Structure 1
Amino acid sequence: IRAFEDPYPQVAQTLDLNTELEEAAKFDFDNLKFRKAYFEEVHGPLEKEGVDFWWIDWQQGAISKSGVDPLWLLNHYQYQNAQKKHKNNIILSRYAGPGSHRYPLGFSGASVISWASLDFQPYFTSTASNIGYTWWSHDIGGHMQGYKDAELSLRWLQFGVFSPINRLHSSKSEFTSKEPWHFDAVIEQSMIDFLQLRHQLIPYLYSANLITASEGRALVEPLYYEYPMEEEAYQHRNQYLFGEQLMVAPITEKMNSLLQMGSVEVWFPEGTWYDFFSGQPYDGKVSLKVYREITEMPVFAKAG
């Protein structure tokens, strides 16, 4: 809190700063008095204007006098402070090491906009369950730099809708808005359809959320949680269970222009499986390349 800020006069009084030399209240989350002034005199007035929860966007390193990562101090203390004004409140912040699942939500940050970034992200998301960090929020469509491709934006939103959190976000570019109507009529209508589907899924998500909190079961599981002895459950990095009723195989590669379809190799466990959207059937157990138009996503449900 530097001397130009609206809350500086109050913070300066509380922390006994030299205002004629414009002494800054430097960030120091090791300091009880700094934390109190931060929550009460900096965040407090903004909460009084109606701010519901804090997006903690920390990128300035792991240095403190205590040896505790400032990101851990922010997530721990801010999550606790958020509970004062709202029940079951959240933050939005980067991962701060094992145990930091106690402070949801995860914020993965400034991904490069690319097919490569999208192709990593389902694997990234399901693997995080292996250290209990089950509420990653990715920038849907990628954050910054990289390249324009409306199909990449659409595939990324398909994944986002079947991810822990569906937060559209972008860079300071004039050219990277995630608004569906940024794109052509086909892409726009598909994005609107998927965004409506996310809200259709809120009952299923909210129920799975209470199961994470009460039973320690991740919403997103790697295949090998359910199928630990099947070698194919370790060979489909981007395939996952989404709650207990759905199995997702996102397409994360640009379509083959000769087919006008993208594809992913799906492992179908033993049993009868249906495409969630079309009812197309599949007899497990089999590994099978599946093809979808850019407007369609491979999501499967078992008989029953």
Structure 2
Amino acid sequence: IRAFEDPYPQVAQTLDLNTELEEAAKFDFDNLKFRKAYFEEVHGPLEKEGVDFWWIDWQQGAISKSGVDPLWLLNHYQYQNAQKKHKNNIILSRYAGPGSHRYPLGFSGASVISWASLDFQPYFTSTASNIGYTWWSHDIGGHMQGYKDAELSLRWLQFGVFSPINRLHSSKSEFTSKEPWHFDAVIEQSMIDFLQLRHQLIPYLYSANLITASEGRALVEPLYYEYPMEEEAYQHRNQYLFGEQLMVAPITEKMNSLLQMGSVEVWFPEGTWYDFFSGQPYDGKVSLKVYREITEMPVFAKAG
């Protein structure tokens, strides 16, 4: 909190700063008086204007005199402080090491906008369950740099809708808005359909959320949680269970223009499986390349 800030006079009084030398209240989350002034006199007036929760966007390193990562101090203390004004409140912040699942939500940050980034992200998300960090929020469509491809944006939103959190976000570019009507009529309508589907899924998501909290079961599981002895459960990195009733195989590669369809190799466990959208059936157990138009996503449900 530097001397030009609206809260500076109050913080300066609380922390006995030299206002005529414009002494800054430097960031110091090791310091109880700094933390109290930050929550009460910096955040407090903004919460009184109606701010519901904090997006902690920390990128300035792991250094403190205590040896505790400032990101851990922020997530631990801000998450606790957030519970004062709202029941079951959240933060939005980067991962701060094992146990930092206690401070949801995860914020993965400034991914490069590319097919390669999207192709990593389902694997990244399900693998995080292996250290109990089950509420990653990715920038849906990618954050910055990279390149334009409306199909990439649409595939990324498909994944997002079947991810822990569906937060559309972008860079300072005039050219990277995630608004559906940025794109052509086909892309726009498909994005609107998937965005509506996210809200249709809130009952299922909220029920899974209460199961994470009470039973320690992740919403997104790698295949090997359910099928630990099946070699194929270790060979489909981007394939996952989504709650207990759905199995997702996002398409994360640009379509084959000769087919006008993208594809992904799906492992179907034993049993009869149905495409969640079309009812197309599949007899497990089998590994089978599946093809979808850019407007359609491979999501499957078992008989029953």
The count of corresponding residues between Structure 1 and Structure 2 is 304
How big is each residue's C-alpha offset from its partner over 1:234-263, in whole Å with a ceiling of 9 and x where there is no partner?
000000000000000000000000000000
Give 1:303 deviation, angstroms.
0.1
Distance 2:157 2:24 in 1: 42
TM-score, normalised via structure 2 length: 1.00
How big is each residue's C-alpha offset from its partner over 1:71-120, in whole Å with a ceiling of 9 and x where there is no partner?
00000000000000000000000000000000000000000000000000
SS at match of 2:287: strand
Question: 2:68 aligns to what?
Answer: 68
Distance 1:21 1:283 in 2: 75
SS at match of 1:170: coil
Distance 1:15 1:301 in 2: 58
Q: CA RMSD in A?
A: 0.1
Distance 1:243 1:20 in 2: 58
Distance 1:299 1:31 in 2: 49
Distance 2:122 2:43 in 1: 34
Give 1:289 deviation, angstroms.
0.0
SS at match of 1:20: helix
SS at match of 2:46: helix
Give 1:16 deviation, angstroms.
0.1
Distance 1:20 1:244 in 2: 62
Distance 1:65 1:33 in 2: 16
TM-score, normalised via structure 1 length: 1.00
User: Residues 238-253 of structure 1: matches in 2 within 5 Å?
Assistant: 238-253=238-253
Which stretches of structure 1, 4 residues or more, deviate above 4 A after TM superposition? none
Question: 1:81 aligns to what?
Answer: 81
SS at match of 1:160: helix
Any gaps of 5 or more consecutive residues in structure 2?
none
How big is each residue's C-alpha offset from its partner over 1:9-67, in whole Å with a ceiling of 9 and x where there is no partner?
00000000000000000000000000000000000000000000000000000000000
Distance 1:218 1:109 in 2: 21
Distance 1:29 1:244 in 2: 40
Distance 1:170 1:16 in 2: 40
Distance 1:234 1:264 in 2: 15
Question: 1:206 aligns to what?
Answer: 206
Any gaps of 5 or more consecutive residues in structure 1?
none
How big is each residue's C-alpha offset from its partner over 1:264-299, in whole Å with a ceiling of 9 and x where there is no partner?
000000000000000000000000000000000000
Question: 2:165 aligns to what?
Answer: 165
